[PDB]
Design a protein around this ligand. Structure first.
Ligand SMILES: *[C@@H]1O[C@H](CO)[C@@H](O[C@@H]2O[C@H](CO)[C@@H](O[C@@H]3O[C@H](CO[C@H]4O[C@H](CO[C@H]5O[C@H](CO)[C@@H](O)[C@H](O)[C@@H]5O)[C@@H](O)[C@H](O[C@H]5O[C@H](CO)[C@@H](O)[C@H](O)[C@@H]5O)[C@@H]4O)[C@@H](O)[C@H](O)[C@@H]3O)[C@H](O)[C@H]2NC(C)=O)[C@H](O)[C@H]1NC(C)=O
Ligand SMILES: *[C@@H]1O[C@H](CO)[C@@H](O[C@@H]2O[C@H](CO)[C@@H](O[C@@H]3O[C@H](CO)[C@@H](O)[C@H](O[C@H]4O[C@H](CO)[C@@H](O)[C@H](O)[C@@H]4O[C@H]4O[C@H](CO)[C@@H](O)[C@H](O)[C@@H]4O)[C@@H]3O)[C@H](O)[C@H]2NC(C)=O)[C@H](O)[C@H]1NC(C)=O
Ligand SMILES: *[C@@H]1O[C@H](CO)[C@@H](O[C@@H]2O[C@H](CO)[C@@H](O[C@@H]3O[C@H](CO)[C@@H](O)[C@H](O[C@H]4O[C@H](CO)[C@@H](O)[C@H](O)[C@@H]4O)[C@@H]3O)[C@H](O)[C@H]2NC(C)=O)[C@H](O)[C@H]1NC(C)=O
Ligand SMILES: OC[C@H]1O[C@@H](O[C@H]2[C@H](O)[C@@H](O)[C@H](O)O[C@@H]2CO[C@H]2OC[C@@H](O)[C@H](O)[C@H]2O)[C@H](O)[C@@H](O)[C@@H]1O
Ligand SMILES: *[C@@H]1O[C@H](CO)[C@@H](O)[C@H](O)[C@H]1NC(C)=O
Ligand SMILES: *[C@@H]1O[C@H](CO)[C@@H](O)[C@H](O)[C@H]1NC(C)=O
Ligand SMILES: *[C@@H]1O[C@H](CO)[C@@H](O)[C@H](O)[C@H]1NC(C)=O
Ligand SMILES: *[C@H]1O[C@H](CO)[C@@H](O)[C@H](O)[C@@H]1O
Length: 549
């Protein structure tokens, strides 16, 4: 490829500086087999208007090439129509002033997996170089506002596998420069094993005689328990929570001191996380990435944050924290003690159906900001010191005010929410929820009979239509899975993990098929306790389902 225009070379130091913060076009060009094969529609350019409008400077563009080869060995030719769509998407992003990073995505485990026992590594190395040569040529003439990323979370388990990770970086660089254009001065992102901080710290080595301006990219989905909703962990924000996060990011930067560091994916998704812990986590992540000179990019698979169809951010409180990292935000407080028998969150006004309406006190972490005003989701501004009262970290709400939203007999569900405008930082939102214990359409079932697939139990949600976690106990008292949760406190013992074991939708609570075969295998009746928010205790806001055997 030959390029007719000019190219403003940018340094890796400057590139990462100007991309902060970023957002992912998730489950789009990375979907399999086609871009709308998963949860997302055909990509539309308006989406990038929203990303710009919400304050992001850059867009990371994951692309799965696995299903877009028109020839096999040797040529391994990629469809020109796909290369054209990828090229056009990059144009939509840059032409709205957003920086771009494009990659080879789920090819990482679909065919580029070197840890698999039968992996033809010579055929992998060829197919990778054939691929980046074709990507390189088509994008060879793109402005410096486009960067190339080697490969997404590449499987890696050994020091021996890590050298194969570094080789992926070399094959990639030799292909992109042989493709010509502006690529010899294009910014690139090299990767380590699994894009894990430690695997990269343990095994990553910089390619010898490298000439492209380059930065390092890693992903952060830690701590596993809170981020993935495992073992009943529904709280984050303790001093140990903070030290462990700061420790993970600090040992990476300590290994790679003068290297620009891109945090390519991160997400405490509003789908599964409790809001106050979620907002505390993103605040301390942005705070951490700034301390270690790292530019973050949030993962958004289309459902976690931006609704592309409306321009509405589902979690606008988060978005403001990442897009204005130079401000101190005051956040609602929440339980962070792993041994507490009750859990609270200042992101909610909870009221139980059939109880008297009482005053509600929500502790906030003001962080030297002052409260300016409060606004409900119906447009009325609340009257200070009559409709709500501040005392230090407490923000107290009169029963007479709250009765103007719910009663002892009013319907259960989500009520309006309060948006609290502070002197600086993001403006957190408190959600009023009228809640009762949900009821299920079934209370027991023969594991044998319900076998086949996942077990859907229709549920009457009452309040928050989210499932918090599930307890799993055999009849003789042994835990169904993961014995080690016995050290996880009143809300963690015998609890199971989101998606793997339990799930939910609009009309059901879901036990995955794998859970049932753990009950069938255990061979004794198992009590599953579905738990919901608020977790006022381990028993009130719960409902039992038993699998007989
Ligand atoms: C969903 O189902 C739940 C279980 O089916 C049900 O919870 C049960 O509720 C009843 C009624 O209140 C409780 O009965 C009360 O129990 C106490 C003594 O309880 C303590 O000891 C029992 C018995 O332990 C012995 O047997 C087990 C056999 O599995 C052996 O391991 C053990 O070594 C003993 O020999 C024990 O089950 C209890 O343990 C529960 O609570 C502890 C402490 O929090 C947890 O660590 C543990 O996970 C477990 O949940 C308990 O320590 C007695 O004094 C009272 O008079 C009364 O009889 C049951 O204890 C309780 N059972 C369980 C397994 O929780 C829920 O009510 C129901 N929920 C809904 C919404 O319907
Ligand atoms: C405070 O209270 C207010 C209520 O007054 C809350 O505001 C509502 O928030 C929700 C979530 O942000 C929002 O619902 C979306 O509104 C749009 C209608 O204008 C729709 O575009 C959208 O549907 C998509 O999103 C759903 C939930 O996110 C998906 O379940 C659904 O399938 C839709 O997704 C389709 O399209 C996407 C495109 O990417 C694709 O991935 C999917 O496959 C699918 O095809 C929602 O209905 C409400 O509109 C908001 N209401 C108002 C008045 O603005 C606010 O969130 C509260 N704050 C809290 C709780 O913190
Ligand atoms: C560059 O990165 C590498 C890789 O991340 C990093 O080396 C790692 O350092 C950490 C600590 O900095 C080591 O973790 C220790 O591991 C052993 C077990 O192997 C334990 O003895 C230690 O635990 C102590 O403290 C714990 C706190 O929870 C307690 O559990 C315990 O009681 C102990 O007192 C500790 O966790 C880790 O093993 C190494 N990894 C390797 C492969 O060497 C290195 O420090 C980084 N360098 C720089 C300059 O940043
Ligand atoms: O729900 C729509 C599709 O979701 C797919 O899961 C996506 C998630 O939405 C995304 O947030 C997450 O980061 O990636 C997965 C993609 O799944 C793949 O992840 C990497 C590999 O290790 C996994 O084996 C692989 O499955 C889901 O895969 C689809 O089934 C849904 O249509
Ligand atoms: C591995 O791939 C190479 C290159 O495509 C091919 O020539 C070779 O036959 C394959 N080897 C095995 C053992 O499958
Ligand atoms: C905050 O609220 C708690 C419980 O409502 C109370 O014990 C504490 O003294 C309050 N602090 C104030 C009002 O400054
Ligand atoms: C409970 O039953 C399981 C079934 O496999 C068995 O392995 C376990 O040892 C039993 N333990 C107790 C304490 O009854
Ligand atoms: C948070 O506050 C609630 C009251 O709203 C308590 O029930 C809980 O124990 C925690 O202190």
């Amino acid at each position: 490829a030959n390029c007719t225009g000019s190219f403003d070379a940018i340094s890796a130091s400057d590139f990462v500086a100007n991309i902060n913060p970023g957002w992912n076009l998730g489950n789009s060009l990375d979907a399999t087999p086609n871009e709308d094969s998963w949860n997302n529609p055909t990509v539309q350019e308006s989406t990038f208007d929203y990303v710009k409008a919400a304050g992001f400077k850059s867009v990371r563009l994951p692309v799965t090439w696995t299903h877009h080869f028109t020839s096999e060995s040797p040529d391994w030719t990629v469809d020109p129509k796909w290369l054209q769509r990828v090229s056009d998407v990059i144009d939509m992003i840059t032409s709205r002033g957003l920086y771009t990073i494009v990659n080879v995505h789920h090819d990482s485990w679909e065919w580029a997996d070197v840890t698999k026992s039968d992996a033809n590594i010579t055929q992998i190395e060829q197919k990778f170089e054939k691929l980046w040569y074709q990507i390189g040529t088509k994008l060879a003439c793109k402005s410096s506002m486009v960067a190339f990323e080697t490969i997404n979370e590449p499987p890696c388990n050994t020091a021996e596998d890590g050298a194969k990770i570094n080789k992926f970086n070399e094959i990639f660089l030799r292909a992109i420069n042989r493709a010509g254009g502006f690529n010899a001065k294009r910014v690139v992102n090299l990767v380590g094993g699994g894009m894990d901080s430690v695997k990269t710290s343990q095994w990553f080595k910089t390619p010898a005689n490298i000439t492209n301006p380059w930065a390092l990219q890693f992903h952060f989905y830690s701590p596993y328990d809170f981020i993935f909703s495992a073992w009943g962990k529904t709280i984050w924000g303790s001093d140990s929570d903070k030290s462990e996060l700061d420790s993970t990011l600090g040992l990476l930067r300590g290994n790679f001191t003068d290297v620009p560091i891109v945090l390519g994916e991160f997400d405490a998704s509003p789908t599964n996380t409790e809001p106050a812990a979620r907002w505390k986590y993103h605040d301390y992540l942005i705070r951490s990435t700034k301390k270690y000179n790292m530019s973050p990019i949030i993962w958004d698979n289309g459902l976690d944050h931006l609704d592309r169809s409306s321009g509405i951010w589902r979690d606008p409180v988060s978005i403001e924290i990442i897009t204005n990292g130079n401000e101190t935000n005051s956040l609602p407080d929440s339980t962070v003690d792993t041994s507490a028998p009750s859990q609270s969150s200042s992101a909610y006004i909870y009221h139980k159906v059939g109880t008297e309406v009482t005053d509600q006190t929500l502790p906030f972490i003001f962080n030297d900001n002052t409260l300016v005003s409060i606004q409900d989701s119906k447009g009325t501004t609340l009257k200070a010191d009559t409709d709500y009262t501040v005392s230090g970290s407490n923000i107290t709400f009169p029963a007479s005010f709250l009765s103007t939203y719910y009663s002892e007999t009013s319907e259960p569900g989500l009520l309006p929410n309060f948006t609290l405008k502070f002197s600086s930082g993001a403006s957190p939102v408190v959600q009023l929820v009228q809640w009762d214990t949900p009821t299920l359409s079934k209370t027991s079932a023969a594991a044998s009979s319900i076998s086949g697939s996942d077990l859907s139990i229709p549920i009457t949600w009452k309040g928050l239509p989210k499932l918090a976690t599930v307890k799993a106990l055999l009849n003789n008292g042994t835990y169904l899975v993961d014995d080690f949760t016995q050290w996880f406190g009143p809300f963690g013992e015998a609890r199971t993990t989101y998606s793997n074991q339990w799930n939910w939708d609009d009309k059901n609570v879901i036990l995955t098929q794998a859970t049932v075969e753990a009950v069938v295998a255990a061979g004794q009746d198992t009590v599953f306790t579905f738990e919901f928010f608020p977790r006022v205790d381990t028993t009130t806001n719960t409902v039992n389902f038993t699998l007989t055997v």
